[PDB]
Design a protein around this ligand. Structure first.
Ligand code: HEM
Ligand SMILES: CC[C@]1(O)Cc2c(O)c3c(c(O)c2[C@@H](O[C@H]2C[C@H](N)[C@H](O)[C@H](C)O2)C1)C(=O)c1c(OC)cccc1C3=O
Length: 406
């Protein structure tokens, strides 16, 4: 029924900064709704048109329910987010309908942007200490600071950990361990995570004992109210998820944002408005997540002219719609003064990113620190020699970002 392009939608060779994988253009040329080959077997359908994508992502017939995914995917697709049944109610990405609204209710007050903003000075301090350490190591060594491994994931990880009351001192070890717990929680096979698990449980114990209106306290109070009774293990599971959600995507994006700033594309006298417009363009141009998470048709659906069967796995093309010439003049150029137009980098519909305000705050705070404390920071290699890639369902990321910070 649909036009068919017989390729894996996740195919990604090593890319330059300015280019996006060829599959996006081949899908868009085929039609608004394109059959493709799902990586773990059978068909999948990609949505290549912005307006249609917005309709799909708000249509209750397309659901996250991982039980609708083909049998062949279980244990293999790894892009499939499939908690054990009893943990799906605690997993924002695994539910829709009333169960999803409940979790949105629990998370909303915890991400109150007024409360995040009170943390700006701490966020700056975090970034500034990480950068001073990196500059000092480069002074001693004679080697450029490598900001992907030394900054991009560490900075957002330390922010979200501190917001949740989880006192991490080694972000590299924490990043590895929360990755393991994420994979286990979302249904992967099967390594030592006990140190991190101790800190997560300590943050939950502390949330229950103390009335201080922090993030984890508010999650606790609101989950207790909605579920009647919530266990320490359930809260640990929920905060594990927000640690991973809060750092991986953000850290992938920040590597790209850093590259564009350090390439000298931000005006030297840029005011706050110009900075936030620069961040906005970077979110259009370098989305870390190329497709929405899997949705499945709950019934037979005809959409954009095409008949999709019950069970049909559907992807919205974020990277391709963000760089569609039908809505963006010179879609593959980086133009921060471009008129502001919508993008799909944070999703749409009920499952829209709950972290967007935080990710923005972190972005603009990082640039402030850089501009004020490392005004001469530059790339240690040309912008045209930077490369990025992604395998499978992982976020897009630079291979490295070598910088002379001062
Ligand atoms: C630039 C950084 C980030 C980007 C690009 C990003 C992108 C996205 C996208 C595309 C989705 C929706 C997925 C879908 O519905 O298919 C989403 C959801 C989500 N994000 Fe973000 N995100 C970012 C930062 C953050 C941060 C800082 C947090 C904090 C914990 C967060 C937590 C979440 C959560 C929990 C969801 C699930 C919402 C739902 O299913 O209801 N994210 N993100
Ligand atoms: C793009 C936004 C995002 O999907 C949000 C998100 C998320 O909301 C949750 C968790 C996440 O891991 C993620 C992220 O998802 C991963 C896995 C996906 N297959 C895909 O590879 C994507 C790029 O990364 C990011 C959790 O891992 C999780 C959890 O893990 C055990 C426990 C409770 C809730 C969540 C929970 O809500």
């Amino acid at each position: 029924e649909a036009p068919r392009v017989a390729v894996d939608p996740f195919a990604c060779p090593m890319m330059t900064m300015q280019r996006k994988p060829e599959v996006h253009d081949a899908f868009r040329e085929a039609g608004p709704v394109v059959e493709v080959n799902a990586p773990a077997g059978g068909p999948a359908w990609v949505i290549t048109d912005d307006a249609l994508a917005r309709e799909v992502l708000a249509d209750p017939r397309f659901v996250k329910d991982p039980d609708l995914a083909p049998a062949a995917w279980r244990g293999v697709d790894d892009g499939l987010d499939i908690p054990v049944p009893e943990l799906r109610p605690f997993t924002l990405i695994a539910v829709d309908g009333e169960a999803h609204r409940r979790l949105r209710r629990i998370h909303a007050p915890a991400f109150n942007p007024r409360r995040l903003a009170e943390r700006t000075d701490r966020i700056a301090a975090i970034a500034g200490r990480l950068l001073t350490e990196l500059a000092d190591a480069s002074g001693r060594s004679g080697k450029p600071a490598e900001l992907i491994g030394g900054f991009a994931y560490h900075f957002p990880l330390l922010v979200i950990c501190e917001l949740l009351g989880v006192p991490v001192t080694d972000p590299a070890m924490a990043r590895e361990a929360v990755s393991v717990l994420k994979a286990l929680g979302l249904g992967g096979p099967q390594p030592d995570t006990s140190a991190l698990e101790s800190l997560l449980l300590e943050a939950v114990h502390s949330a229950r004992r103390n009335d201080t209106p922090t993030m984890t306290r508010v999650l606790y109070e609101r989950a207790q109210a909605e579920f009647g009774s919530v266990s320490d293990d359930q809260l640990v599971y929920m905060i594990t998820g927000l640690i991973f959600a809060g750092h991986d995507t953000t850290g992938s994006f920040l590597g790209f944002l850093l590259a564009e700033v350090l390439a000298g594309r931000l005006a030297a006298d840029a005011d706050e408005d110009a900075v936030s417009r620069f961040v906005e363009e970077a979110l259009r141009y370098h989305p870390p997540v190329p497709y929405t998470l899997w949705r499945f048709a709950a019934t037979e659906v005809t959409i954009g002219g095409v008949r999709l069967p019950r069970g049909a796995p559907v992807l919205v093309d974020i990277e391709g719609t963000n760089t569609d010439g039908r809505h963006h003049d010179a879609p593959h150029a980086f133009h921060p003064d471009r008129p502001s137009w919508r993008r799909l980098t944070f999703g749409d519909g009920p499952h829209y990113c709950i972290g967007e305000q935080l990710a923005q705050l972190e972005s603009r705070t990082m640039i402030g620190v850089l501009r004020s404390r490392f005004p001469e920071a530059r790339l240690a290699v040309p912008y045209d020699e930077l490369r990025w890639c992604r395998k499978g369902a992982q976020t897009a990321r630079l291979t490295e970002l070598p910088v002379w910070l001062r």
